[PDB]
Amino acid sequence: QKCDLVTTGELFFRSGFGIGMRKDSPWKQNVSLSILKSHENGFMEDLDKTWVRYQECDSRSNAPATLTFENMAGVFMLVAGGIVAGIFLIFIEIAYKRH
Amino acid sequence: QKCDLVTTGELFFRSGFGIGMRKDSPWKQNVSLSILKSHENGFMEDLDKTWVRYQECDSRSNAPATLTFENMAGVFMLVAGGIVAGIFLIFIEIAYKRH
Amino acid sequence: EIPRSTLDSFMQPFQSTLWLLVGLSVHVVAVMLYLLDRFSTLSSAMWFSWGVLLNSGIGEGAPRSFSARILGMVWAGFAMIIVASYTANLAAFLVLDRPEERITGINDPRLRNPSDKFIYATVKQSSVDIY
Amino acid sequence: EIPRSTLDSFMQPFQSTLWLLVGLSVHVVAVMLYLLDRFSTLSSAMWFSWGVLLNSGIGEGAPRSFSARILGMVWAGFAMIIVASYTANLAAFLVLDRPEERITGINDPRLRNPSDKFIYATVKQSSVDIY
Amino acid sequence: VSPSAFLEPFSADVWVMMFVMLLIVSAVAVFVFEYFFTIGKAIWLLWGLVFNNSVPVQNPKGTTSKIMVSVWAFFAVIFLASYTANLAAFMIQEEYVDQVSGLSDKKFQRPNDFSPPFRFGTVPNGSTERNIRNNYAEMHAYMGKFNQRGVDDALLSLKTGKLDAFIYDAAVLNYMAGRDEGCKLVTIGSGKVFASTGYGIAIQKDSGWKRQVDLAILQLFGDGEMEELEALWLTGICHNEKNEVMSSQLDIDNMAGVFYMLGAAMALSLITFICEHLFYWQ
Amino acid sequence: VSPSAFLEPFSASVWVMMFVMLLIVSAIAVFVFEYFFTIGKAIWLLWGLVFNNSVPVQNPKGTTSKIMVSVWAFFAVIFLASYTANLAAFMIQEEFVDQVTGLSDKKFQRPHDYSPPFRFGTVPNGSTERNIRNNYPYMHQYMTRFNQRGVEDALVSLKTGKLDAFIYDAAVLNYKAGRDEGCKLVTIGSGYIFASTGYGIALQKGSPWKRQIDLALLQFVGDGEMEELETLWLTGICHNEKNEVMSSQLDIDNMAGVFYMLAAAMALSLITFIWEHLFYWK
Ligand SMILES: *[C@@H]1O[C@H](CO)[C@@H](O[C@@H]2O[C@H](CO)[C@@H](O[C@H]3O[C@H](CO)[C@@H](O)[C@H](O)[C@@H]3O)[C@H](O)[C@H]2NC(C)=O)[C@H](O)[C@H]1NC(C)=O
Ligand SMILES: *[C@@H]1O[C@H](CO)[C@@H](O[C@@H]2O[C@H](CO)[C@@H](O[C@H]3O[C@H](CO)[C@@H](O)[C@H](O)[C@@H]3O)[C@H](O)[C@H]2NC(C)=O)[C@H](O)[C@H]1NC(C)=O
Ligand SMILES: *[C@@H]1O[C@H](CO)[C@@H](O[C@@H]2O[C@H](CO)[C@@H](O)[C@H](O)[C@H]2NC(C)=O)[C@H](O)[C@H]1NC(C)=O
Ligand SMILES: O=C(O)[C@H]1CN(CCCP(=O)(O)O)CCN1
Ligand SMILES: O=C(O)[C@H]1CN(CCCP(=O)(O)O)CCN1
Ligand SMILES: *[C@@H]1O[C@H](CO)[C@@H](O)[C@H](O)[C@H]1NC(C)=O
Q1: Which helix (H) or strand (E) element contains residue F167?
Q2: Rg of chain A over CA atoms, in angstroms?
Q3: What is the distance between the alpha carbons of residues F106 and B97, in angstroms, rounded to a whole number?
Q4: B44 touches chain F (CB under 8 A)
Q5: Atom 12 (ligand 4): residue with closest C-alpha?
Q6: Percent of chain B as helix, strand, coil, to the nearest 5
Q7: How far apart are CA F85 and CA F103, in angstroms?
Q8: Cis upstream peptide for D114 (omega within 30°)
Q9: Ligand nearest A29 Cα, by number?
Q10: How far apart are the CA of A15 and the nearest CA of chain D, in angstroms?
Q11: C87 by DSSP, 3-state: which?
């Protein structure tokens, strides 16, 4: 969803979810049978499509950290300072070029 | 000793070379005591230096495998073709000055 | 193992058809610049076309037309792109061509996984055999 | 993590003291070339030398002797030793740069050493809590 | 290699700051000239100094501004070094493409929307065939044309190009993948599975053992012996992946960006020729 | 970085082969030019084309030989690219000097012979002091000044480089180098230590437990759980491979070869000028 938070780590504690319910109540076998039936016929896949994977947006092919305005841009300013010196040297040229 | 073969990996199963003797030998205690005394006084250091650390030929810190003849030798081959163009000089006239 | 960096020829970084296609394209663009000015030289065009890509001192004149300046500047861009590409690819390949690993140790895959192409053994009836 | 190439300035490849050393070296070498013309124009030779390092095509001053000829030979060789050193240094620094990587798993020893600089938690009274 | 990869190393901001610096230095040069031939070629000279000093130039102008063009050459050489260094760094990329994200991919459900069409395979007459037939008849009918004989037959077909993707039971698939002779193949989603199921134990109908074995298996899960059990048994040392691959002989597809730019440049040259043909009376 | 790194991309093979090609192609170029003594400037031209534009020179002659000059420049750009590529790879490394092969290194015996003087110390009053005094007397006399108050004092000194090396018990220093921050400490020898002994379990003299204790310890060592306990409690931390630390600014101490070339050029130019002035009677 957010695409600025990234998951990591190999899947440790490989387990599964499950609807928990009291020991003596009788739905357990029917509940498990219905869950297995839903797994078989792709209804759980429809649920996954509906509420889990709908937007993707997965970061792939990590960028090698391109260069941007930060290190070289200020360099321009630095060489811009040199231009100031040139503005002197042309005026100094007026003192030198005349004779 | 030869610089044609190299150790690799990390040492495992740390054990100690030992002088074995029959279990009923009365020399055990004094052999062990003398061997410890030899370890302590530095005689083992002298024996190691005179029989383990010859190092008459040493190789370490492998180089990044600089270029050689064959890896661009074929490059030279191409300039040979240039010489062929030279022997075309006379026909240059027949190629151009006539046309 | 004596290290050795593989390189078949000058052709290792580049696909074979690349040189032919660039050599025909530069000739085509030189002809394009040469032809379309009169209705309002080829040798100089050829020298620019070859040398400028090859960064040679050959070529002493200047193209006659005006958009030829744009063509020359974009061709200089192409030249710097192609030279930088060759240099970077050659550097990357010469860095990433080191020989295979020299057996990590006891946990080495070639050791953990027996292979007839990589046969290893020791001295029979020794402490290492018992271990 | 956002990929970005951190870098202070173009001074990164070489210390500013080395830049000052080469800047004085070019000028003293140019002065030596001009003064050796005794038994053979300071501005011409100095501009030529200071542009050869800089690859600029400007400058028509040229030596006329054989000693200064060899000096120009080795000076061009030197200047491209500098440029090759620059490109190699910058390529190496950029290739190694941004080497930070996410945690590959709990097995990473970074987890095994707690610190304020390395904090990790979960939800209290959860399954992983009793785990 | 990305077709436009040569333009990523620099941000567009500096990519236009260099042009505006060219504009300002050209302004300086023309202001120097105003006190008194290169006015139309000053930009060309500066550009050639930027890229490569291989073009003849009418350079001698403004001996005081020749210091300026030397400074421009300094900028040009450091810029070329920076560009080569950045272009190098972008080309030690770790190999990664990925063609499949899951069985619900558009490539799966629409196999004929590609040229050549996306071919995937499975073993017929298996339980997976029953599942796909009951769940998705259309792609199963498409499969009817890509039947497979055996597991090793599927392996060889995939290696020899007779197949592109295989569909089969997950656990044996992972076991085979981790123990390939070169680990030249891959799994999917690291375990994002369609029709997920588990391998378990079979007990008599409602015996008293079921509870005890359930708690025992959950305990061994909690203690953590299992993870190292499959680490020692059904995984491989090289199971994870391989390292970066060398950049091969550059393909025209990788370098087609400059070809596209060449086409754009020749089109622009043609339209400038047309404009000159419309503006040749001055 | 190796001081002779710039000569690393020059084997004897490529050096002699390239130079002999230089001479022979100079000869072929000048004898072609004879048709269409300038022969002394063709070498200038060819060395420039190897390097770059040098100065306006008389290249254009024998329009067919311009093709030969073009292919020569093609080889020149290949050579420059190869030089860049090979130099790039040869200054990327992390180098571990292997400063010491053991306490018997000749550096230890003569600390003052190296500038700055070799400053290594040991914790006084312990068994290490007695051992070093009984084995290496003059060494102990020189250690009399390099004692450290505590273990952490010497550790901090090594962290900030107050002392060059530290002498102490092997296992405790291994343990400290394990959990040390940043892995700035290195233990050396792989067991090659003076008075190489071991930790052990003490027993009452002549106790019946000796045989069982020894057999159990050897069984534990043989099967491998001993090193498992080791890794559980000992220095598995750090244990990383020092691949490459950032190659700092290539200093004069590193690239002094260029200054040595400059000095050689100065001397050779002066010698050639002297020889030229000698030949002034013709
Ligand atoms: C779990 O699901 C079972 C589905 O098989 C279900 O068993 C079925 O239960 C119904 C009604 O409870 C039985 O239908 C009976 O309906 C009337 C009145 O109940 C009887 O007179 C009929 O004769 C008929 O038997 C099904 O026969 C029965 N089927 C089976 C195979 O047992 C369970 O009741 C469900 N249990 C829970 C807790 O959900
Ligand atoms: C191990 O080395 C020990 C070194 O001190 C040694 O101790 C001493 O050994 C000498 C002779 O080996 C004994 O001298 C005895 O010899 C005569 C034999 O006729 C005895 O009758 C006398 O009592 C005389 O003392 C020392 O007594 C003995 N010192 C002690 C404190 O025991 C051991 O004997 C050596 N043992 C072995 C098994 O090599
Ligand atoms: C090491 O043991 C010596 C004893 O041999 C201690 O020597 C003392 O050193 C202090 C200086 O700090 C002197 O003022 C005392 O006169 C010394 N006493 C003796 C009896 O020599 C020394 O303090 C001990 N150091 C450590 C760190 O344990
Ligand atoms: O429980 C079982 O019986 C096995 C069955 N196996 C089926 C193999 C796939 P197919 O039947 O050929 O489509 C997978 C592992 N579990
Ligand atoms: O068994 C023991 O007594 C200890 C002694 N320790 C001594 C450390 C050297 P120093 O004597 O302190 O200078 C090392 C670990 N074992
Ligand atoms: C199942 O497939 C095999 C080929 O693998 C074929 O020989 C057999 O006849 C098929 N049987 C059915 C029922 O499809």
Answers
A1: strand F165-167
A2: 34
A3: 79
A4: yes
A5: E126
A6: 45, 0, 55
A7: 41
A8: no
A9: 1
A10: 11
A11: helix
